[PDB]
Design a protein around this ligand. Structure first.
Ligand code: DFP
Ligand code: DFP
Ligand code: DFP
Lengths: 175, 175, 175
């Protein structure tokens, strides 16, 4: 089954998505969004909580599906700590790039998912003996969620940041 | 493979969905919908057939996916009879609540699916030795179809009736 | 994993779908569409490349999902050559019927997918000893993608051509 990190992230996303339905999106953004005023700059959770918000059924479903499968595999094969670090770094960096191009009104797990996509693919190519890889079939469908992101079907710089982080980390780990 | 009950329900839903495309939704409602005039009150199938109608591709697909997996597991592990009773009771009760709040113009397998969700989850927690349970990952995605229902993303009373029936039955069976 | 034919078809579809996002649909049609002027009648790839174009995320995703599973199983169980021939014949014939009813502005893998659906189902019924079959559950969901096609939820003649080819071939192979 899904490890504690994979699992708790899913719970958090659902609860937050529930709170968004009840109180409204903007009400919830006010509390969880990347700091959107200087008075909010020391509320450190805001640098990470943006990733917990989803704006439609399909948004949370595809993010949670990918997180479940990829985050789930990383945690099981490489440990909770690894999942935690990949998650914290991609959220922060994709969040910062996103905000820089398009402002602080955004949310979603996809920066993290892209990181997990980049990481799991590069790690499987370069370090097969790790037991972790992205299957051919799934590479195709990962590329589709990825293309959905690049052509607004997020800021593509944030997209890139998500991916890059995953790649850079997979690269370091292969060494 | 899928048992006779799981299987026949899927066939029926598809055929009915096909008849809906050909003749139109309303034409089919006229025959399968919860009684919508006193002249129709003795046509007993109407208390159950409302559940066989779907109004979009995504409506039937998600209902049939969940029914396939959950109904399929109940039938295999606990027997066709159990599936039949859960199905008949949730359809009737969710149907009655639905109609009471929003009138007789409705359809879909989701009252039943919610029952199966409630039943399979509660049964797995309380009676593990039964071989039946809802995995962590799937709990998350069940909650999403459930939230899709509660926030009209059905009458939530009907929603509750569906769930309650599943829970009440799982509760009795754990004893 | 997915064989070379199953795999290369997916790559081609994604790359083409990418080129469609960048250059636009019509720009790409101009090069890959069924001949739409006599000057183009000797460009033989056009009789097959129409199948590589997809017009939405859901279009390519469902086609590629089905192709992945069904094409993947055919190639693994019966060989790359078989997949190649089914693919070439259904593309050509469904493409020709499509164009005859609705003109040369169309694209998609679904004519091929329907062929694979017809082929895998009929082959499993008639030649069980072949190791290839369409499971009950999946029959239901195949019928849904099929119904999505028939009721424009393609020209149904093309739909039929796709299916027929799959059936005719499964029929010949059962002998
Ligand atoms: P991601 O969760 O999803 C994109 C595919 C739109 O979005 C960014 C804002 C993290
Ligand atoms: P369900 O089939 O689906 C809901 C999620 C809308 O609907 C009721 C009417 C049974
Ligand atoms: P297919 O790829 O998809 C249909 C379900 C619309 O379409 C034809 C044009 C091949």
């Amino acid at each position: 089954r899904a490890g504690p990190v994979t699992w708790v992230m899913m719970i958090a996303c659902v609860v937050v998505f529930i709170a968004m339905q009840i109180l409204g999106d903007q009400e919830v953004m006010l509390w969880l969004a990347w700091p959107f005023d200087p008075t909010l700059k020391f509320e450190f959770w805001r640098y990470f909580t943006h990733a917990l918000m989803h704006f439609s059924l399909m948004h949370i479903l595809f993010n949670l599906l990918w997180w479940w499968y990829l985050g789930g595999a990383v945690e099981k094969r490489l440990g909770s700590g690894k999942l935690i670090v990949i998650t914290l770094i991609s959220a922060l960096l994709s969040g910062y790039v996103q905000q820089k191009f398009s402002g602080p009104w955004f949310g979603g797990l996809s920066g993290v998912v892209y990181a997990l996509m980049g990481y799991v693919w590069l790690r499987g190519e370069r370090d097969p003996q790790s037991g972790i890889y992205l299957q051919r079939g799934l590479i195709i469908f990962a590329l589709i969620w990825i293309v959905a992101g690049w052509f607004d079907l997020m800021a593509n710089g944030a997209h890139i940041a998500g991916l890059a982080v995953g790649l850079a980390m997979a690269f370091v780990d292969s060494l």
